XYZ file of C-alpha atoms in Angstrom:
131
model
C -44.639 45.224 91.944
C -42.895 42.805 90.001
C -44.793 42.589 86.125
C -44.231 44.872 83.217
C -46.821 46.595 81.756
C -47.557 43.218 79.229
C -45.635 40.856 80.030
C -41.885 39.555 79.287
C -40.444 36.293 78.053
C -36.772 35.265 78.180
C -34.939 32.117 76.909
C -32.461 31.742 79.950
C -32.993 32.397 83.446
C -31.702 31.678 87.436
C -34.484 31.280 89.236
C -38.023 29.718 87.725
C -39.548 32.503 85.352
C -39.564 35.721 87.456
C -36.584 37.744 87.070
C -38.146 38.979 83.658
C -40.880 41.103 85.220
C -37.510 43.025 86.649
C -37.652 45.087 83.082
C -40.286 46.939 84.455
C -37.996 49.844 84.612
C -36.599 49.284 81.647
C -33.261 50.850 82.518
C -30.295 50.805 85.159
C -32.622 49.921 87.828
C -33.716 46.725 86.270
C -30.873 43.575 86.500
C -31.745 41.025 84.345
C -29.514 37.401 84.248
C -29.883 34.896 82.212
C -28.701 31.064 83.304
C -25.383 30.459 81.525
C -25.855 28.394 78.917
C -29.124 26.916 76.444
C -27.604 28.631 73.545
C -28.406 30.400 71.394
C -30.407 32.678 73.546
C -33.819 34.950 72.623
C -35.885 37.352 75.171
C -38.976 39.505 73.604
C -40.800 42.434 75.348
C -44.788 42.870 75.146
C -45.524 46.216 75.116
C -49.485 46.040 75.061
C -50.349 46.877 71.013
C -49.387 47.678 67.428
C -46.930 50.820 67.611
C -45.121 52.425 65.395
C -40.805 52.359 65.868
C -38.400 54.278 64.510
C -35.073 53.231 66.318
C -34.335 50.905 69.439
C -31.437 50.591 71.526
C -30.391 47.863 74.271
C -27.411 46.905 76.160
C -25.309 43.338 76.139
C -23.777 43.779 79.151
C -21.118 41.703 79.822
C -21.898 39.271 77.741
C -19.963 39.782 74.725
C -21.696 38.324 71.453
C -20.859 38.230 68.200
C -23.749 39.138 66.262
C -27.523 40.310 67.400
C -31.029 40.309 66.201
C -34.027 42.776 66.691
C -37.613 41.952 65.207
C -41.149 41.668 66.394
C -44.347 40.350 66.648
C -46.483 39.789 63.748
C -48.792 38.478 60.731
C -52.386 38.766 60.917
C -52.234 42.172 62.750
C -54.302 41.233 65.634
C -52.763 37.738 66.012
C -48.733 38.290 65.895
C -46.253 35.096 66.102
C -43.099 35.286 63.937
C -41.188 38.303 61.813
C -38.332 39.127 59.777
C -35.655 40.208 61.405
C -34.499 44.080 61.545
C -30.393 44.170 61.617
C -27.853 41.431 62.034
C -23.942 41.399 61.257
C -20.374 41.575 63.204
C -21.592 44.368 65.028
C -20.978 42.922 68.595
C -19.619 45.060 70.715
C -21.114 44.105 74.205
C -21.478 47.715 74.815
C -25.390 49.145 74.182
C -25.967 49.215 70.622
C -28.626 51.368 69.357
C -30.578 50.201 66.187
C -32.316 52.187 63.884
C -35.015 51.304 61.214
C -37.868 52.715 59.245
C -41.205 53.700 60.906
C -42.834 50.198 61.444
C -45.838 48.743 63.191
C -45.329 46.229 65.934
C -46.484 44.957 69.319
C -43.935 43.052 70.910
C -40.436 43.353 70.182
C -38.214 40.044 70.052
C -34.242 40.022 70.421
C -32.598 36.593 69.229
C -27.990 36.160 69.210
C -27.391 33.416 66.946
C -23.801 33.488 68.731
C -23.925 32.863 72.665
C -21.938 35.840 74.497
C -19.524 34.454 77.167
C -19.884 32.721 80.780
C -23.267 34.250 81.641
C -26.185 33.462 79.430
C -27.645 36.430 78.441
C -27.962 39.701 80.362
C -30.539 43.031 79.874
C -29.907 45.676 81.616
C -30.485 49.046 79.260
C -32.789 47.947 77.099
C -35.756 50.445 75.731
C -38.439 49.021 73.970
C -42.167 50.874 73.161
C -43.554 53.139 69.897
């Protein structure tokens, strides 16, 4: 029992790939640690297909950073790769952060800090994502 319902990708990581299937919860019960360092550092979510958002929130944990950035997947509709980005500005905070946009169609959703966040890499532990 250790894959979400797509399938996860992070940019930092202890072990060798496998701690990102821990989402599968999605909440408290999930712990999700990122190696320290390999800045700046990314993770995206697959849910499974296009869905329509309205407002996401996840958690920084620990890991104090001074700006965030929430997008998706996609381009050709069937065939997603890169996006525009949804928020970003001195809204740190490491506590969760809930973000809120327009109704939008996407499949995966993609999280990138252009500022690193302190000792530990990058961490995930309240983070919803699905439309």
């Amino acid at each position: 029992n250790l894959a979400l319902n797509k399938a996860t990708a992070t940019s930092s990581i202890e072990t060798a790939g496998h701690e990102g299937d821990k989402a599968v919860d999605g909440n408290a019960a999930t712990r999700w640690a990122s190696a320290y360092g390999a800045s700046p550092q990314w993770i995206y979510i697959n849910l499974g297909s296009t869905q329509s958002i309205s407002r996401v929130k996840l958690n920084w944990e620990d890991a104090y950073a001074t700006a965030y950035s929430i997008q998706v997947s996609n381009d050709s509709g069937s065939t997603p790769t890169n996006w525009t980005t949804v928020y970003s500005t001195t809204t740190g905070d490491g506590a969760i952060d809930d973000i809120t946009f327009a109704a939008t169609n996407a499949k995966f959703v993609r999280v990138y800090a252009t500022t690193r966040a302190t000792a530990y890499g990058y961490s995930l532990w309240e983070f919803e994502v699905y439309g």
